């Protein structure tokens with residue numbers, strides 16, 4: 001096969017994340033929230049399904065902001081506890097189809113890690129997948145080409161990649177690539193999107209959250 005490795009040296013470098021504690025998850029929430037808020041007017045204008053009522057971005061932003069506010073007032077090193085705080089804030093602030101779905105995605109994500117103090121890349125992936133399950137079960141009649149589709153494709157990318165990727169930065173980068181591909185495909189699933197010439201507004205809002213998650217993993221601010 002290969003050279004048998006036996007070196008006592010430990011690999012170098014700083015730009016990698018092995019474990020996510022409660023303050024890194026808080027930073028992901030905060031930066032995700034801020035990135036969404038900065039894009040809310042755009043996400044509103046994209047809204048066409050089920051009605052073109054100009055509100056997806058507002059709805060998602062208000063929902064996410066409720067979660068963020070609870071987090072910022074109640075930080076913890078324990079990721080499971082921080083997730084309970086985030087979940088509660090989303091669920092007591094969910095607005096619209098998109099904000100309800102967002103709160104259910106993150107309810108299932110957070111429930112999956114409730115007893116953890118920190119998570120690794122595999123459990124980050126598993127938590128995205130748990131959130132997709134929760135959200136699909138919450139919606140009586142799921143429709144494809146939507147925030148659900150983008151979340152599901154993102155979580156299956158996460159599962160696959162995490163199996164051989166310990167770095168949560170590299171994992172989240174891949175999740176975003178694959179979530180973007182799914183978002184760009186939404187008009188091929190939901191007719192009104194292709195007729196109007198837009199991607200799904202809920203899916204776009206979710207991408208905005210994920211992009212902020214990556215900024216936080218890199219130790220950066222939106």
Ligand SMILES: Nc1ncnc2c1ncn2[C@@H]1O[C@H](COP(=O)(O)OP(=O)(O)O)[C@@H](O)[C@H]1O
Pocket residue numbers: 047048049050051053055056057059060095096097098099101139141142143144145146147148200201202203
């Ligand atoms: N049945 C559904 N299945 C999946 N996603 C849905 C469904 N209904 C709505 N959505 C999502 O919600 C987004 C619209 O959110 P929003 O504008 O907040 O809804 P509304 O103003 O109709 O309450 C859609 O672009 C889509 O992502």
Ligand SMILES: [Mg+2]
Pocket residue numbers: 053055096
């Ligand atoms: Mg509405």
Ligand SMILES: [Mg+2]
Pocket residue numbers: 047049050051052053054055056096
């Ligand atoms: Mg709307």
Ligand SMILES: [Mg+2]
Pocket residue numbers: none
């Ligand atoms: Mg387990």
Ligand SMILES: [Mg+2]
Pocket residue numbers: 152153156
């Ligand atoms: Mg898929």
Ligand SMILES: [Mg+2]
Pocket residue numbers: 015169170
């Ligand atoms: Mg890197």
